[PDB]
Design a protein around this ligand. Structure first.
Ligand code: MYR
Ligand code: MYR
Ligand code: MYR
Ligand code: MYR
Ligand code: MYR
Ligand code: MYR
Ligand code: CL
Ligand code: CL
Ligand code: ZN
Ligand code: ZN
Lengths: 21, 29, 29, 21, 21, 29, 29, 21, 29, 21, 29, 21
């Protein structure tokens, strides 16, 4: 999930965009 | 666990910003 | 309206603290 | 919606609970 | 205190309500 | 100590939300 | 007034950073 | 009060120091 | 205008998330 | 400036990218 | 690294507050 | 830098003032 990926490594703005609707 | 909860507080704030008009669904572990 | 945008940034942090493990959906439009 | 109710009037914590999954 | 309890374990909304006036 | 200070920044924000009109007293360790 | 509520959420984070070990009291009413 | 002074006019950091214990 | 001050506190957190390793400059005046 | 553009109209993420070093 | 990034999010918020009208330059490691 | 000092030890308001313009 989002917590498993971005709270273990830094997420770039593109990676955060993958979680948008 | 606490330090996981703190990361989520920033995460939704970051997710709200990056998504904007699109929105997002936040589901924890 | 930017004043609208600022309230969203506080709405998301409110939803994060309120739902917790449940999660929340942010849908302005 | 949540924007038209909790951003034009102050919402107590329970009012935010309505929008949880 | 509040730091000793909620910064070592997750505090639920009821537990935070114990710190209110 | 730093990571304790960061938890307090969220804590007062969380405490402000949950308490609301009642208010709160924040005293650190 | 929600605009009042938003300023409180920034007032508390200001008081937390300003007082530090002293602590602060938030009393709108 | 703090709401009637620092939320209707911008308060410098010292102005916030008045309300510390 | 305090409403101006509140938008700055959200502008800085936006610039921090946007620039990242680059960094940002905040200059209202 | 950034205050006169992104605080009187909502700025998308790219609009914030203009002000990075 | 994540927990360094979280500290920066508070840092710029704290730096924005303390500096105010002066402003600041935030450059990470 | 700022990260090297304030994210390893607590920084007081004077220390943060050293980073201002
Ligand atoms: C909810 O139960 C969280 C599940 C994720 C695991 C938390 C611990 C992961 C291992 C890191 C430990 C480091 C902190 C001592
Ligand atoms: C998408 O645009 C949401 C649709 C409803 C927007 C209503 C905005 C009203 C203007 C803000 C007034 C309140 C300011 C605090
Ligand atoms: C103020 O002096 C803080 C007092 C609380 C103790 C801090 C350390 C507690 C033990 C955890 C160490 C884990 C980090 C290496
Ligand atoms: C409790 O209700 C506090 C009593 C004083 C409230 C004053 C609110 C004035 C309306 C806000 C005007 C400024 C908007 C940024
Ligand atoms: C320094 O004072 C910045 C110069 C420009 C300030 C413009 C402020 C306009 C008043 C705020 C209007 C919008 C409120 C959300
Ligand atoms: C960017 O690459 C960060 C560089 C700073 C070093 C990060 C690790 C420092 C040593 C602390 C490790 C404690 C966490 C396991
Ligand atoms: Cl954190
Ligand atoms: Cl605001
Ligand atoms: Zn944090
Ligand atoms: Zn705000």
């Amino acid at each position: 999930g989002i917590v498993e990926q971005c709270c273990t490594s830094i997420c770039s703005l593109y990676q955060l965009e993958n979680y948008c609707n | 666990f606490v330090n996981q909860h703190l990361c989520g507080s920033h995460l939704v704030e970051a997710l709200y910003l990056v998504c904007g008009e699109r929105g997002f669904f936040y589901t924890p572990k």
